[PDB]
Design an enzyme around this catalytic site. Structure first.
Site, PDB file in Angstrom:
ATOM      1  N   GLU A  36       8.251 -11.291 -47.161  1.00 30.99           N
ATOM      2  CA  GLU A  36       7.154 -11.580 -46.242  1.00 30.99           C
ATOM      3  C   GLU A  36       7.728 -12.321 -45.051  1.00 30.99           C
ATOM      4  OE1 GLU A  36       3.084 -12.313 -48.940  1.00 30.99           O
ATOM      5  OE2 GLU A  36       4.112 -13.964 -47.928  1.00 30.99           O
ATOM      6  N   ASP A  47      -2.769 -22.077 -43.978  1.00 29.77           N
ATOM      7  CA  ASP A  47      -1.584 -22.421 -44.748  1.00 29.77           C
ATOM      8  C   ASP A  47      -1.530 -23.868 -45.184  1.00 29.77           C
ATOM      9  OD1 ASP A  47      -0.632 -20.142 -42.633  1.00 29.77           O
ATOM     10  OD2 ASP A  47       0.427 -19.909 -44.551  1.00 29.77           O
TER      11      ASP A  47
END
Length: 244
Positions: A36, A47
């Protein structure tokens, strides 16, 4: 998109610089089932603390959007390992969806994940991704209900990405519950981003059905601490997590 039992490293593009990112990717390719690559954003509100700081580092140091394509293109010269581009919608939207996806595909990107893809644009986006040969990766969190997991699974062409903001140093029950619910609904493979940091987390998660386990915070933490010289330490962490 990946073999069952795959460890999927997550790295922030441009942290600390695009060359170092390329170096980390190559040093970890041998342990990865997929990778990723995160595109730094000014407001990575989805996040955790660790990854948000890597976004800040990347941007401060002058990261530019297409430097991500550079990293992918260069990586591709040495590897065929599946690559998922992780980004916030803003960048794609501001650059033109099809333009971005067309450009991503050309560089070597196999799948894409848009953290905050507006449900309003869900349909159009997936239709374009397919036309451009890009697989879709959708995210789901512990507060995602069964009916939505299904809708998500029906739109997914890459794999379903299960996340957990909880953190840990144990994987929360809410994490395991999300996993348990997803495997009972998804025909697609699922990868888990529950912030692993120990070997037992990897074994456990795979034993409970995760087709793949992502390792991002753990790696990003070392990169925030070792900068360009993170490589060697990254290799060891992954080995420890892989029981090797």
């Amino acid at each position: 998109m990946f073999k069952d039992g795959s460890l999927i490293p997550y790295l922030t593009a441009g942290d600390p610089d695009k060359q170092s990112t390329l170096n980390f990717l190559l040093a970890l390719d041998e342990y990865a089932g997929a990778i990723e690559l995160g595109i730094p954003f000014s407001d990575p509100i989805a996040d955790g603390k660790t990854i948000q700081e890597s976004h800040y580092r990347a941007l401060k140091n002058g990261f530019k959007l297409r430097e991500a394509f550079w990293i992918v293109k260069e990586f591709r010269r040495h590897s065929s390992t599946p690559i998922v581009l992780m980004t916030y919608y803003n960048p794609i939207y501001r650059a033109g969806v099809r333009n971005f996806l067309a450009e991503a595909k050309a560089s070597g990107v196999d799948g894409i994940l848009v953290v905050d893809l507006p449900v309003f644009h869900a349909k159009e986006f997936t239709e374009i991704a397919r036309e451009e040969g890009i697989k879709t990766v959708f995210l789901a969190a512990p507060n995602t209900p069964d009916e939505r997991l299904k809708v998500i699974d029906d739109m997914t062409t890459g794999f379903v990405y299960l996340v957990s903001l909880y953190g840990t140093e144990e994987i929360p029950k809410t994490a395991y519950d999300l996993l348990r619910r997803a495997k009972r609904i998804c025909r697609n493979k699922v990868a888990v981003g529950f912030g692993v940091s120990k070997r037992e987390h990897v074994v456990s998660l795979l034993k409970e059905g995760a087709n793949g386990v992502v390792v991002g915070s753990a790696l990003v933490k070392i990169i925030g601490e070792k900068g360009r010289e993170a490589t060697e330490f990254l290799k060891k962490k992954v080995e420890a997590l892989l029981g090797i």
